[PDB]
Amino acid sequence: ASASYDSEEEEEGLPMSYDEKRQLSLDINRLPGEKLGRVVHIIQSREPSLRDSNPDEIEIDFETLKPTTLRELERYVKSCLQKKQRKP
Protein backbone atom coordinates (compact mmCIF):
# COMPACT_ATOMS: atom_id res chain seq x y z
CA ALA A 1 0.00 0.00 0.00
CA SER A 2 2.99 2.19 0.59
CA ALA A 3 6.60 1.74 -0.52
CA SER A 4 8.67 1.03 2.57
CA TYR A 5 11.69 2.86 1.12
CA ASP A 6 14.05 0.04 1.21
CA SER A 7 17.49 0.59 2.38
CA GLU A 8 19.51 -2.30 1.29
CA GLU A 9 22.88 -3.75 1.92
CA GLU A 10 23.43 -5.19 -1.52
CA GLU A 11 27.11 -4.54 -2.14
CA GLU A 12 27.11 -6.18 -5.51
CA GLY A 13 23.65 -4.87 -6.31
CA LEU A 14 23.66 -1.22 -5.48
CA PRO A 15 23.93 1.46 -8.15
CA MET A 16 27.09 3.45 -7.62
CA SER A 17 27.04 7.17 -7.95
CA TYR A 18 29.27 9.08 -10.37
CA ASP A 19 30.95 10.43 -7.27
CA GLU A 20 31.62 6.90 -6.04
CA LYS A 21 32.89 5.83 -9.45
CA ARG A 22 35.08 8.95 -9.48
CA GLN A 23 36.56 7.96 -6.14
CA LEU A 24 37.07 4.45 -7.40
CA SER A 25 39.30 5.72 -10.15
CA LEU A 26 41.23 7.77 -7.60
CA ASP A 27 41.52 4.87 -5.17
CA ILE A 28 42.78 2.63 -7.91
CA ASN A 29 45.48 5.17 -8.77
CA ARG A 30 46.18 5.31 -5.05
CA LEU A 31 47.22 1.68 -5.30
CA PRO A 32 50.74 0.70 -6.37
CA GLY A 33 51.21 -1.61 -9.39
CA GLU A 34 51.78 -4.52 -7.01
CA LYS A 35 48.23 -4.16 -5.74
CA LEU A 36 46.79 -2.94 -9.02
CA GLY A 37 47.41 -6.44 -10.28
CA ARG A 38 44.50 -7.71 -8.24
CA VAL A 39 42.05 -5.02 -9.25
CA VAL A 40 42.96 -5.76 -12.89
CA HIS A 41 41.99 -9.43 -12.36
CA ILE A 42 38.82 -8.37 -10.58
CA ILE A 43 37.75 -6.52 -13.70
CA GLN A 44 38.93 -9.34 -16.02
CA SER A 45 36.65 -11.65 -14.11
CA ARG A 46 33.72 -9.94 -15.78
CA GLU A 47 35.43 -8.02 -18.53
CA PRO A 48 36.88 -10.18 -21.23
CA SER A 49 37.51 -7.00 -23.14
CA LEU A 50 40.35 -6.20 -20.76
CA ARG A 51 41.69 -9.75 -21.30
CA ASP A 52 41.41 -8.96 -25.02
CA SER A 53 44.04 -6.30 -24.50
CA ASN A 54 47.37 -6.54 -22.70
CA PRO A 55 47.18 -6.88 -18.84
CA ASP A 56 49.76 -4.09 -18.75
CA GLU A 57 46.85 -1.84 -19.45
CA ILE A 58 43.94 -1.69 -17.10
CA GLU A 59 40.65 -1.38 -18.85
CA ILE A 60 37.87 0.08 -16.83
CA ASP A 61 34.63 1.61 -17.86
CA PHE A 62 32.65 2.66 -14.85
CA GLU A 63 29.50 3.00 -16.92
CA THR A 64 28.88 -0.39 -18.45
CA LEU A 65 30.44 -2.22 -15.51
CA LYS A 66 28.02 -3.91 -13.18
CA PRO A 67 27.85 -3.32 -9.34
CA THR A 68 29.23 -6.81 -8.95
CA THR A 69 32.51 -5.82 -10.39
CA LEU A 70 32.50 -2.10 -9.48
CA ARG A 71 31.91 -2.73 -5.81
CA GLU A 72 34.44 -5.55 -5.78
CA LEU A 73 37.04 -3.05 -7.08
CA GLU A 74 35.99 -0.66 -4.32
CA ARG A 75 36.01 -3.40 -1.74
CA TYR A 76 39.55 -4.19 -2.57
CA VAL A 77 40.90 -0.66 -2.88
CA LYS A 78 39.15 0.36 0.32
CA SER A 79 40.61 -2.61 2.18
CA CYS A 80 44.08 -1.42 1.11
CA LEU A 81 43.45 2.24 1.75
CA GLN A 82 42.19 1.67 5.26
CA LYS A 83 45.76 2.66 6.25
CA LYS A 84 47.49 2.70 9.62
CA GLN A 85 46.95 6.45 10.01
CA ARG A 86 43.26 6.46 9.29
CA LYS A 87 42.79 3.52 11.53
CA PRO A 88 45.49 3.41 14.21
Binding site: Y18, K21, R22, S25, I28, N29, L36, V40, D56, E57, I58, E59, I60, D61, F62, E63
Partner: peptide, 12 residues
Protein backbone atom coordinates in the same frame (compact mmCIF):
# COMPACT_ATOMS: atom_id res chain seq x y z
CA UNK B 1 37.34 15.83 -26.44
CA UNK B 2 36.55 14.40 -23.07
CA UNK B 3 36.49 10.77 -22.23
CA UNK B 4 33.88 9.16 -19.95
CA UNK B 5 34.94 7.85 -16.57
CA UNK B 6 37.55 5.34 -17.55
CA UNK B 7 41.18 4.91 -16.70
CA UNK B 8 44.11 3.31 -18.49
CA UNK B 9 47.12 1.81 -16.81
CA UNK B 10 50.37 2.84 -18.33
CA UNK B 11 49.85 3.49 -21.95
CA UNK B 12 46.82 4.26 -24.05
Amino acid sequence: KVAPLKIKLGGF
